[PDB]
A paper describes a structure:
The first identified human member, ClC-1, is essential for maintaining the permeability of Cl− across the plasma membrane of skeletal muscle fibers, gCl, accounting for approximately 80% of the resting membrane conductance and assuring precise neuronal control of muscle contraction. In addition, the complex gating processes that regulate CLC channel activity remain elusive, with only a single available structure of a channel member, namely, that of bovine ClC-K. Each CLC monomer has a gate that operates independently from the other (also known as “protopore” or “fast gate”), structurally attributed to a specific glutamate, “GluGATE”. Here, we have determined structures of full-length human ClC-1 using single-particle cryo-electron microscopy (cryo-EM), exploiting a purified protein sample that displays Cl−-dependent single-channel–derived ion conductance.
For structural characterization, sample in the presence of 100 mM Cl− at pH 7.5 and in the absence of nucleotides or antibodies was initially employed. Assessment of the 3 major cryo-EM maps obtained in our structural classification reveals different arrangements of the CBS domains, suggesting intrinsic domain flexibility at pH 7.5.
Numbering used by the authors:
A (entry chain A), B (entry chain B): 115 to 253, 262 to 591, 595 to 669, 818 to 872
The structure:
Amino acid sequence: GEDGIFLVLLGLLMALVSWSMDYVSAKSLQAYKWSYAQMQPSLPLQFLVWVTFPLVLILFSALFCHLISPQAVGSGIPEMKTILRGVVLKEYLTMKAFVAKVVALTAGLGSGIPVGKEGPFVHIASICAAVLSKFMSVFYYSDILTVGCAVGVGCCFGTPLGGVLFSIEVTSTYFAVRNYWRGFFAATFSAFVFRVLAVWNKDAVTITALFRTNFRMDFPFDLKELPAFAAIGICCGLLGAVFVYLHRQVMLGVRKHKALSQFLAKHRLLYPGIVTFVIASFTFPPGMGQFMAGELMPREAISTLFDNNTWVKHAGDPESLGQSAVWIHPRVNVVIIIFLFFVMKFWMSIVATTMPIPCGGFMPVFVLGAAFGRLVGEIMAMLFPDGILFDDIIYKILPGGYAVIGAAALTGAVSHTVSTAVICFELTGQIAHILPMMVAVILANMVAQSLQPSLYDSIIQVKKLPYLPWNQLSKYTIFVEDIMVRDVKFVSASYTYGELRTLLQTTTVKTLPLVDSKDSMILLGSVERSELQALLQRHLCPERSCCIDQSPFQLVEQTTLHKTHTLFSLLGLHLAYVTSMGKLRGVLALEELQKAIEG
Amino acid sequence: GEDGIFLVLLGLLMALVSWSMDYVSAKSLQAYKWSYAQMQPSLPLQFLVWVTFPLVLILFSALFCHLISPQAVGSGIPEMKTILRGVVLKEYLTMKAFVAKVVALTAGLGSGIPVGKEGPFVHIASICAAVLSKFMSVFYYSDILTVGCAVGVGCCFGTPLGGVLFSIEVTSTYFAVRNYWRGFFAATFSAFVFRVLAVWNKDAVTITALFRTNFRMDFPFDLKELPAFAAIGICCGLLGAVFVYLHRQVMLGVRKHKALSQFLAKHRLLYPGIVTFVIASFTFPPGMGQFMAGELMPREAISTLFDNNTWVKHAGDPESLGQSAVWIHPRVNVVIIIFLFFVMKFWMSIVATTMPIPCGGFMPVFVLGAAFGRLVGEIMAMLFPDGILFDDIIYKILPGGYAVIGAAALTGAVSHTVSTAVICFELTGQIAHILPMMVAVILANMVAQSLQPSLYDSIIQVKKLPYLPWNQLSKYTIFVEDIMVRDVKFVSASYTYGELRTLLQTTTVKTLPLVDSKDSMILLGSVERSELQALLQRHLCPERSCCIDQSPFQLVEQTTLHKTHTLFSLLGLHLAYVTSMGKLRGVLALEELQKAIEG
C-alpha cells in the first residue's frame, strides 16, 4: 500500500539512475568510435588513440576505487549475501562510498573492456534501499536487502520476474512471500520506468525489451537438432566449470608471491592499466580484429550475434548486411573467427574481472555463451544445408536461437541458478525456445553443481570472509562443549536505586538479560538498556511503562554443530544463551560457529 | 540427482496421465458435435440430443462423486494448503479415491459445461507424489505436497515457472529453495514431456505452447491506449471481487434452508443435473446461440477470441473467416453478442462450480477475462478506426492483446496472485504485452486484496475447516492461560524392569517424553515408543543403542496467541510442551489455537 508508495519512489529513483549511467556510457562510447574513425587512418596514430582512451578511463576508475572508497573495491553480491546471512557491516553501507562507486562503475561501463554491470548495481540498490528506509518511515533488515537485490537486477535489464527469482534463488534459505510481493511490485515498476523514459527523452519506439530478435516462430526448432541442444547443455557446463576454476587459478596468483605483493604496496596503480594495455594490444582491428572483429563493443556485438540468417550462406555473398559485415574476413572461414573470438574473449574476461575493480560476473559470461551458441548454430547450418519441406515452404534452420539458448546456458552454469534463463528470454523478446532453454539450463546446472563450486562462493572462500556455509555431513562426535562463553552480565528487577545507578555506570551494551536473582542464574528476559536510561534520567530531572519481553530460545548443551547452525538458520538469529535448568551457563556467538565449522 | 530421478519418473507419469485425460476429452467432444450435426437439423431432436448428452455425462460424474469417493467431493487446492499448514488427513490421501476421481474429472472435462481443470489435478498430483514417495526411497512432508502442487499446475498447462510460482506464492509462509530447485526441475520435465508426446503419437507440429497467437510485434501497443490498460486493471478486479462475493451468496444458499437439505438427504442425485439441464436450455444454438454463439466449447472458444483482426471491420464483410464466423449475427452488432456471452457465462460459471463436483477455479474465470478483454479491445477499435502512421506503414490496433491481458488480469484478481500472469503469457506464446499485463495484474490484485477475500479462503471459511489464518491484530490482553492441557505422560530412564513392562502395557502413542524423575517434572527429551518395544521384545526373545534426542522448544506461559501462532508458523511444528523452570506444566495443541483465535 503506502509501503508500496515507499517502493514506488525507490523504483522511480533507481530507474532514473540506471538510465543516466548507460546513457552517458553509450555517449562516451560513440564518441570513442567516432573520433577513432574520423581523425585519419594512421596506423601509428590510431594505435595511439586505441591505447590511450581505455587505459586512461580505467586509471580514472581505479583512482576512484582507491582514494574515496576504503573498502568497496571488488564490490558485488557475495558480501551482501553474507550480510543478510548475518555478518553486518554498517560502515560498508556508507552513502559516501555510493557516489564514489557508481561513476567509476560508469567509467567501468563506458570502457570497451568487458565488465559486468549487475553486481555493484545490486550493491548500490541495496544502499539506496537502506538509506530510503532511514529517510521514510520516520516521516525488517534482510527484507530491505532482498528487495534491493530484486530492484537492482530488474533495473539493470528491465526483467521483473527474473529480478525476483534472481533475488530469491540463492540469497536465502527460507523466504517470506510478503517480500516476494513487495519486490515483485518494486521490480515491475523499475522495469516499467526504465523503458518508458527511453520513449520519453530519447527515441525508443514503443516498448520492446531491449533486443527484438525477429524469428520466424513458424516451425522453429525442429525436434531433430534437439539432442544437439543436449550437447549445448552439457559442454557449456563443462567449460563453465573450468571458468570458475581458472578464476581461482588467478586469485591465488593474486596473492601467492611476496614479490608482487611488495611491488603492489610499492605501487598499487601499476597493476590494472598495463594489462588493459596488453589486451588492447590484441583488440586493435587492423592489428588483430582482422581475425577478431575487434570493433565490437559488447552490447551491439551480442545484438549482431542475434542475426536471423546463416552467415555461412552469406559467406557466399559479398552483400552489405547489417553490422555483421564485421564478421567477414574475405579469406578465412567465419567459424574460425567465431572460435578465435570466443577463446580470446574467454581468457580476457577472467583477467578483466581480476583487477581491483567493481566487477559484475554476468555480462561477459553472457557474451561468451552467445558466442558458443552461434558457433554451434552455424556449424549445424553447415551440417544440414537442406532444411526440410512443408506446405509450399522450404524451412532451413537458423543459428540465432542456438545463440540465445547457449547464452542462457553457460552463465546459468557459472552462476549456479535457473533464473538466468528467465532474464535471458526476457531480454530476447520472443519465447519460442523456452522449454529447450530451460532443459539445457538445468542440464548445465547439474553438471556445474557436480563438478565445481559457485562463482561467488569461490569468491568469498578466497577473500576469506566470515560466513557459515555445510555439504550435508553430520559425523560421529560434534558437540558444543569447547565453544560456549561463560561470561554473564546480569540485571534483576529487585535490584534497587544504588545498584541501578551502578548498572548505568558499569555497562554499555544495547539490550540486557533480566533474571530474578543472580544466585538463581535463570535467564528470564531482555530489556533495552537505553529505555532504562530514559526512565531513570527523565525521572531524575522532573524531581528535585516497564514491559518485560521474553527470551525465545534455549540451547541444550550437547547440540551438534550442524543442528546448531540449522537452529540459527531457521530462526535467522545471531546468538545463544546456553542454559541447563534455565540457569544460564554459556554464551554461543556466530563467529565461534564459523571457527567451529572450520572443521 | 537420484532424487531427481525420482522426480523424473514422477513427471513422466504425470504427463502421461494428463495427455490421456485431455485426449479422451477432446475425442468425446468432437464425437458430440459430430453426431449433433450429422443426424439431421430437427429442432425437436437436436434439442433432445443437446440435452441428453451433457446431463448424462454429468450424472455419471456425480455418481462417481457419490459412491466410491466418501470425502473427495469438491476437491481442489484449499484442503491441501490446509494440510501442508498442518491439519493432516491421511485417509483423504487414499489411492482408491484417486482413480475414483480422475475419470469423473475426465467426465467433468469432457462435458460442455464450463469446469476448471487444475484443482483436482493438483490434488491427484500430490496423491501420486505421496504414493511414489512411499514406493521409492525404500527400494519432508510439505516438500512432497509443494512439489506435487508445482507438477500439477505445470502439467496442466505446460508452464513450468508459472507452475513453481503458483506452487509457492500462496501455499506457504516460508519456503525452502531446495524444493524450489526440485519442483523447477520436475515442472520443466513434466511440461517437456506433455508437448513432445503430442508430436509423437498425434500431430502437433514442433513445440508451440498451446496457442500461437500471431501478433505483428511491430509497434504493438502503443502508449496511448495504455491508460485504457489502467481501466482493464481496476474494473476487472472490481468485478472479480463481486464474483467471489456471489460465490458466498450461493454457498450459504447451499446450506440455508431445511427444505432443500431434507430433499437432498431424500434425493442427492437430483440437484446437479437439472440445473445443467437449464443452462443447456440457454446454450442450444438455434435457440439462444443465435445471440450467444453457443456452439463454442471453451478451448476453441478462447482460441477464437485470440483472433488477430478487428471483428467490427470484419462485421463490414461477409467473409468466411476462421471459427470467428460463429461471432456474426447478420443483424445484431457483435459488441452486444460479446456482452451477452460475457454476462451469461458469468452467472453460469458460479452455478457450474456450485454443484458437488471436483471443480477447478481457474478455467471459466480465464474465459470470462478473455471475454471482457476482447470486448474492450473491439470497442477501442471502434473508437480509433484510423490507427497511426509509420514509415510506409499504417498501423491500426488489434484486440487480441487486450483479450490476453484481461484474461490474465481477472483470474489473477480472483485467485489473489501474480503467478497467473506468468502462465497467461506462457500459454499465449508471445511476450509482447508483458509489462502491461504485469501492471494490470498487480492493479487488479491490490483492488481485490482491498475489497473481498480470496476464492479459496472463502471456500475454507464456508466449508468450516480447521485452519489457522490473522489480519495483523495484536490487541491489549491475549494470554495462554485458559488453553494449556495439564495432562502429562512420563518416562524415566531410572525406571526399571517392571515399570518398563507397565509402560508397554499402559501407553499407546508414537513418541514419548523422557524426564529424569516424575517429581522433578522437567521435560528432557523424547524417544520413539516402538523402538523401545523393539529393544524390549527383541531382547526378550534371544534370552530364555539408546539414543536420547532433545526437545527443541519451550513455551513461556504468558505468550500472546499471535506470537504463539507465529512460533508454530516459523517452526512449522504442531504441539507445545509448556513449562516453567523446565518443569512441565501444560500442553498446547493446534486445534486449541484455532479455538482460541475464533476470537
